[PDB]
Design a protein around this ligand. Structure first.
Ligand code: NAG
Ligand code: NAG
Ligand code: NAG
Lengths: 57, 50
């Protein structure tokens, strides 16, 4: 949403671009646009939805 | 100097003009061809006249 995706080697995070502070990737750290086919160098990784545990109550 | 991939540098230059970075990645081949073509016009502009 504003930041970079980065990986430590095993896990994927999102950071602000001027200081390394790794956050878990979520539907509110991010925004969608379209299918995966269009984008060069896209990677397969899980995005966490913060509503899913709460709506599961 | 901090390295960054050129298509990711261009995404952060697109966010700088208020155009959301997916508008680059979804059009990256078009934007690359328009840039390569526009540098080609500079060679003609400087070759054909002083
Ligand atoms: C990457 O970060 C996660 C944070 O939970 C950690 O579990 C994992 O060991 C790290 N991997 C490496 C290669 O450092
Ligand atoms: C990045 O470079 C490597 C080695 O040249 C290549 O295998 C890979 O396809 C390149 N990345 C993309 C997005 O094509
Ligand atoms: C990404 O994941 C989907 C669903 O598991 C799969 O169809 C696709 O082939 C994967 N692509 C790569 C590059 O692993």
């Amino acid at each position: 949403r504003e930041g970079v995706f980065v990986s430590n080697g095993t896990h994927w995070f999102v950071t602000q671009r001027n200081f390394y502070e790794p956050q878990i990737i979520t539907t509110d750290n991010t925004f969608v646009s379209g299918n995966c086919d269009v984008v060069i160098g896209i990677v397969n990784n899980t995005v966490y939805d913060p509503l899913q545990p709460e709506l599961d109550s | 100097a901090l390295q960054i991939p050129f298509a990711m540098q261009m995404a952060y230059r697109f966010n700088g003009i208020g155009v959301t970075q997916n508008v680059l990645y979804e059009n990256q081949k078009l934007i690359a061809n328009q840039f390569n073509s526009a540098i080609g016009k500079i060679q003609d502009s400087l070759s054909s006249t002083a």
